[model samples]
Target: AGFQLNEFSSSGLGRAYSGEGAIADDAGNVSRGGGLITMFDRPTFSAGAVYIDPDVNISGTSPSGRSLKADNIAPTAWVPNMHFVAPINDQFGWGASITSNYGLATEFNDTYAGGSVGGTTDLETMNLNLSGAYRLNNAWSFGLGFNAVYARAKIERFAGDLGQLVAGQIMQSPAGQTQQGQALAATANGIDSNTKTAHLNGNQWGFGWNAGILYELDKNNRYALTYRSEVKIDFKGNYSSDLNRAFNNYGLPIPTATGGATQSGYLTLNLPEMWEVSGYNRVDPQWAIHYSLAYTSWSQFQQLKATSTSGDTLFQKHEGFKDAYRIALGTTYYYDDNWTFRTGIAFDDSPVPAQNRSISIPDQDRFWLSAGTTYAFNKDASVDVGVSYMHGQSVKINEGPYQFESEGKAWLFGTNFNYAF
Candidate 1:
């Protein structure tokens, strides 16, 4: 799954994430009233969440040319977030934010062709960040922040009677009566249905840092840039299933390193670093514009390696991902005194290489279209609501024994109420 979550702030969503977020450019923006700054100087608290609905489909044929299909058996996912910021005072300010910076959930039918090699994978992360900012002068401000992250993941794969199946194919020819084929043929009948499944779950706690700068060119224009460091998590957990044991018992090659029914292990996972640059410009009293450009170091996700407690290597695979980027533009219209309207568009590049794509995350390039509004009940209170739709490009995967084509799209609706004391 991707590491970007653009719904950290409802106001930002209205403008396609042009403002401050731990994952976006404006990490110093305090949430309060509908406008950029909170009129009241008291402490402010903001809580918001986004609900996403996805529609995705994957289809392919087996080596035998048997048609197979897997629709998204996954359910809707909810991304929750909360933030608190101390009022600007003197030359310094401080605040904290809690959010989900990365996540994913996907599944396939047990009988599908893809399911024979891969089944389900669920990954999630929670970020707790502390930030401080200093107003150097009327024209510039700088911010520094650190994050404590908690991440957990679950992965499942199906082994089935694959050895027997492969052996059957080999035994169909007299030449297959060679030593290797004879050994496989002898063990094929011993493999059973009870050991056809494997499962792995892991969790880790990691840390990272972020820095940003905000420049006020004038009363109506501002620019911001932020960078978030990457985090590496050494996940530890129990990995178990009867599949590996059964393979060994039948004299067949074990597909996984942990040949017993269960084992404890650690896996190294890397979260990518990111950079965001954004600007806000007010052309008149009733209108303003926002834009942003962002880049992610996804190429760091080159491989996944796991090792068991007994020092046996469980698995290691190359991801072959690439760095990615995003660009967006939007504007806000002030309708009278209490209402504001907003619209935006953005394009996000996919980190996954086409050949390495899989059901775990059928990712691709995407386009975002969004609209929203803000209602200011008073100087100290306001409510922001935003809606967005994303269209993803289709992708074809032909990695090893897995061959499939996939397409996906998603919708997100979010609302948040901000009040300053």
Candidate 2:
């Protein structure tokens, strides 16, 4: 469920990541403008990174009637980004950016009461952007960019005492009345088993494009709109675990017996498309306001599909995701010329609905409160520091007879160095 990383620059972080609003102020915001080509004036370079810490707590009940509690299952992440833009002349520019755009990490203790229901999932991605921009006139600029994304993922899930459940079900069936069926049921009763595990690891590459337009309305008003296409990745990886072995030992006639064994398959994952509209207004020499609205086409994420070499579909599940939305408002104060202050608030909607929530993701609606500052060193160099606190609403999840409840909060910190030559 944790698929996207939005913390690309410290300057944007201070304003709840309102990219178009923050773009003109720092080289770190180059990606917001569709790459280096969209930048104006001097050649610029920037490097930035961010750290996120999430405190998540989950408590619930397992299908086997065990109390479940998993604390701090969400792991911390460090993301780095770099950007460069060189203006070829007054009307043209070209640039590149490297960024981590989507990722997630979560692990539950193996000894946790709910270990048999869910485990860990780690997903990481990096994107390289090449772009160019053209100035049609004094009031308009347009840019196009190509993207190459590399992604990797590992997912794990655990199964409780399946032997016992299967045995019990068979014993209640009509077939158990026969001597052969009775013998098989008795054999299952005597089998001693532990939790079983399933694992999938895969990596792949994807390509997409982004385009944007920037307009200057008079001298103090600026507007920007950007669109990013979806990238579809086909992952070829091995699946290995003891669950299929355990099922075979119990003489269970199930699909897992044939499909869940150690094998290689193709898993297709579709990343979402997104678009944003932003405005920056300078009301006076010292004060400015920025606002943005964004949308993500999460509905494109219909399911995760895994297929065998023979084209047999081994696994599939509907994600039932909905499109998500975000809104942000921010303002900056230019205190003299050497220093600036910023603050903002933002609201983010979750794509996962209540009924379709998964324990691994456990995501919900969130609110962001952010603050940041920039220190200018002479005219060509500056440093930006930004921080944000995110509060997520509690979510309740149900998978069969198991019920999981989770609440999360996070803190993010970022810093960047920007220089223009």
Candidate 3:
């Protein structure tokens, strides 16, 4: 048989800022619950529909299988968001929105793909928002919102590296991430198919709040601007202790406690806050345009803090991430009372820049171009069809100490449908 050189494994919006009634946003609206924005018409004081599509890939080299490689994952999914608004009075209004903001699904080739280093890790979230808005004269409005969120996570890591294997003494620990490096060296058998599984799930339901303001100038010829403040999230969950111990028993070096006991218990993560600014204008009755800009301080993601029922500091700290931003533009055309068209463009920055992208999260900067249309079945309800294609810039990565060359690219497509009652 010819020696092969393939393989490895891996895994892992908002908002209203439009000039018409409210803008449609798809930012953080896919999984966690933030930027779920969209563009709609004005003065109707009604809500419209939203939707998205995302694709992913996670893979690496299989230390044991030279030609073992994993390719295009059916990492595609459908996310739809909807909002309903009721005008309490000429100057007051209230509404509710449901959306999915953050989600992921990355699968590797089963035979060699899920082998080692890192398998597939999936993290996803959903949000329900209740909000109030006040119309301030002709061109201004203020909004306040409260949100409930539910999150589910799946994380797994494979141990394949030679040093990590030997330092941890894989042979001594049956659950070795990769096959026994020592076994391969001692017996010259190349360590029986380098692989093992590490699985953990931390799911929780939480709450958060959001507020924003909208301003418009010149009522006849429409134009508007809006700003949405950031919201904070505190997540709490219990560790998959059994899984943790399994990895610990394997002798793998992981972040531990003060007493040197393996970390096995509960953990908390403090997700950072965000800020968004947007503008929209209706040049004519048939055409409208939208644009948005945002910033997220993921740099604040400093530590994975864990707490044991037994009192100990089990935290893994890595400090390198910086602030990130996203810029986007969109447009809508009303062909008739029954037909309308939409198109958009956006650029998003990667939280894991080239210097930090790795086996765990090989993320990159991206750009999106989209188009969609809405069909009004009646006055109060409509069917919105939209699609978007996105791709990121190639990232050049250096693992360890700026020596190893790592590179990656990503692309995604989204679709949606909405209903009103």
Best TM-score goes to which candidate? 2
| lDDT by residue for model 3 (303-406), tens | 55555667554433343567787777777788998887777677767776565565445567666665666677677555545554556554444433222222
User: Lowest-scoring 10 consecutive residues by lDDT in candidate 3?
Assistant: 1-10
Cα distance off (Å), candidate 3, residue 134? 1.6
The per-prediction CA RMSD against the true structure, in angstroms, equals 3.8, 3.2, 8.7
lDDT of 2 by residue, 1-421 (tens): 2367788788778888754533475665667576325446887888888888888788876644556677778888888888887788888898788888787877886545455445678888888888888888888888888999998898765554444555677887996787976887876655334333556779899999998888878667888888888889889987655543445434322224333467787888888888888888888999999888888888888787777787765545558798998888888889987999888899888888887887777788888899899999978889889899999878888754567899979999989899888
Over 4 Å off in model 3, which ranges? Answer: 1-68, 109-117, 161-197, 220-264, 311-319, 398-421
Candidate 1's TM-score reads: 0.88
- Indicate whether candidate 1 or candidate 2 has the larger lDDT: 2
Backbone clashes (count) for model 3: 45
Ranking by lDDT: 2, 1, 3
Where does candidate 1 stray beyond 4 Å?
Answer: 19-40, 160-165, 175-197, 246-254, 257-260
lDDT of 3 at 106: 53
The lDDT leader among the candidates is 2
lDDT of 2 at 238: 70
Clashes of each: 1, 0, 45
